[PDB]
Every structure is written in C-alpha cells, then in structure tokens.
C-alpha cells in the first residue's frame, strides 16, 4: 500500500506540471487523472479513497471536486493554525531593490505549526512581525529552509528590505508568481542578506534548545531574533474541507485563502515503484 502512496504522488506531480502549461489546465488535469493507471489501478479510484496528503495529490482531488485538508502550503511546508486569527489587508511595500509589491498582510496574532517533509516548527507571529520560531530538523539546509519560509511568511519589513534584485519569478506557464512567492523564491536562491539583517538577541540557556546565528552556526549565547533550534525535536488533526480551484490550479478555501498551487508542488521526482500508465 505504501508503494501505492509513493506512486500516486509521482503521478499527481507529473500530471499537475503538465496541466499547468495547457490552455485549460483544469480540464486537462481532470482528463489526465481519469486516463492514468497506477499498478493497474485507476488513478481516480485511488484519489477517491487514498488519504495521502501531498500538494499535487490534493490539487487533483480539488479538481475532482473532493475535500482536502484546510491547511495551506507555503514553501513546501504545511501550515496548520493552532491559535489566533488574522484579517488580510492590502499594503504596498517597497523592496530593498526599490520595487513596489502589493501584498495581503495577515493582520492579527497567530500561532502555526509548520510541517515539512524534512523539518517541523512552531511559529507565533503578529502583524508583520515574527515573535517565535522553534524549528527542528536533521540537517542545516532543512532547518534553513524552514527559517526562510517563516521569515518571508512573517512579512517583516526587514525581510522586504533585504531583497537585492528585481523579482521576475514565473511559473512554468511563464508567469509571475504572486508577491509572497516572489519574496520566497528570492531568498530561497540566497538568504545571506536576509539573515544578516534580521538581527540577533541574547538567549537563555534552556535545555534541549540552541541558538542559530546568521551564518547558520550554532551558538549558546545569541541567536537570530525570535528563532531557536530544538534538538529534542518538534512533534506535530486534519480537517477536510470543500475548496475551489481556478484555471491556474490555485486552490482556495471558502474565504478566499489560497491553500495550494502548482508552485507549492515539489520539484522532486522519485522513481515510481509501481508502473504508471498515462493512457
């Protein structure tokens, strides 16, 4: 059965990528799902009963008109809100390279768990301010990824002003990602200026925790402001809700929040362990 989940993910990822460049990505996504078999199993029959949670899989489920998790994906991390509330407020911000961006500011205090494939974190934030990030993971790059996503997601001014180039990031249909993803891709390419301008702070030596400096060196006395690494590990309750999906394969809940998009589907591709026919 775990072979089925693994091959279902590879199939959904290939189908979502191909649909994104079609003249009707939604109509093409559906006809491909209905035309693909996994180990002799109709893909639609698996999609109707398999509970594997993965960005591409749920985009397919949304296109099939089925319920998916209420959590949203950003930077590959599943964001599950555990406390607080926010109202979105349009703001024009100025990047460090003197360009304007109209972002939807999450105005409110909120607490999230971020569940990545290789990292987990607890995030507390206010309006355009990160309050606390406790992150765990098994290598540096995995923890850096979580920190970057949280800094970008916080929408802090220091993060906007750490941009050092024009933002021209596009999807596979040759088209500009929304402003949040413009910032994310920029710092995923290089986060040195972000880290160096974020700020550090003295920390209290607490058991099982350690600070992390801008160069991603551990330290016992200082740490990136609000950030701590838990060597013990952060340990993660999914509600399946009705969603909409548009011609760009952007999935939204019934209050307009984008939960998923092709740009949130991993570029990774393993090798299917069961044969996949795209008949």
């Amino acid at each position, epitope marked *: 059965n775990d072979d089925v989940d693994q091959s279902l993910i590879i199939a959904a990822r290939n189908i979502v990528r191909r649909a994104t460049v079609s003249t009707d990505p939604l109509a093409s996504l559906l006809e491909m799902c209905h035309s693909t078999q996994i180990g002799g199993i109709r893909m639609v029959d698996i999609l109707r009963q398999n509970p594997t949670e993965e960005q591409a899989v749920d985009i397919c489920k949304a296109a099939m008109g089925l319920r998916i998790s209420s959590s949203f994906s950003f930077g590959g991390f599943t964001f599950k809100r555990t406390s607080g509330s926010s109202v979105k407020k349009e703001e024009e911000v100025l990047t460090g390279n003197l360009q304007t961006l109209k972002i939807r500011v999450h105005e409110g205090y909120e607490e999230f768990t971020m569940v990545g494939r290789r990292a987990t974190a607890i995030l507390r934030k206010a309006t355009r301010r990160l309050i606390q990030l406790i992150v765990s993971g098994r290598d540096e790059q995995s923890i850096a990824e979580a920190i970057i996503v949280a800094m970008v997601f916080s929408q802090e001014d220091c993060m906007i002003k750490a941009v050092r180039g024009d933002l021209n990031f596009v999807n596979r249909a040759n088209q500009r990602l929304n402003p949040m993803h413009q910032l994310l891709r920029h710092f995923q390419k290089d986060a040195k200026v972000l880290f160096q301008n974020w700020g550090i702070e003295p920390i209290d030596n607490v058991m099982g925790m350690i600070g992390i400096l801008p160069d991603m060196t551990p330290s016992t006395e200082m740490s990136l402001r609000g950030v701590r*690494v838990s060597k013990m590990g952060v340990d993660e309750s999914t509600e399946r809700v009705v969603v909409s999906i548009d011609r760009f394969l952007r999935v939204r809940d019934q209050r307009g929040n984008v939960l998923l998009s092709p740009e949130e589907v991993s570029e990774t591709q393993g090798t299917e362990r069961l044969t996949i026919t795209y008949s």
Partner: nanobody
Amino acid sequence: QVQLQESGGGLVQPGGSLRLSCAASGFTFSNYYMSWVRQAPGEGREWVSSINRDGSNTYYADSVKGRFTIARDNVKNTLYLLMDSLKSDDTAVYYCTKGSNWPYDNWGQGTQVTVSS
C-alpha cells in the same frame, strides 16, 4: 574530548557495496542517538540515517531506504553504515555525527565514498 573517526570509504563501481565504520571515543556512546550525514560534490550536507540508543529503531532518508542499513556496536562504541546497491548519486563525503538532530553535538571528519565506473 569527544572523538569520531570514520573509515571504510573509497572507490567502488555502481551497484557495488561498502561498509563504513565510525569509531567513537570520549563519551558514553550508549546514551546517544547516532547519525550519518553526507555531502555530495558541490552540494550541502544532507542527513542520511539515524539510530536510537540501543539500535532497535532506525531512520533513513527515502533516497537510501532499502539500500543502506545503519547499525551500532555499543560495546565497542562504533557506528556503521552498510551500503548496498550504490549509485553514482551516492558519491559524497559521509560524516558520523553524535545525536539525532541538527546541530549535532559532534561530527567526524568524513570518509570519501566515490561510486564511479
């Protein structure tokens, strides 16, 4: 003075096998998770596997699952990585580390594994 010293790396052909060893000294090996972390040419250090204190639970990155086995000898204080069906993309320096999460408490120096025809 914690000490970790890897050995057993070297040159092998695709599909071959290697047995990496890591000699630990200067701490009570028995009371710590141990891990392997690798760095391919031109890339960053990437977690490979972890093993709990008595070796009854193992953890693997999905790229090595079914091909590598992590193991430990708590009497001799040695960690091992038994590599079967090696691929070109397994080429990397392989580091023995103390602990289960980043930042690991201590790192070995690494031994070079080169899988090439």
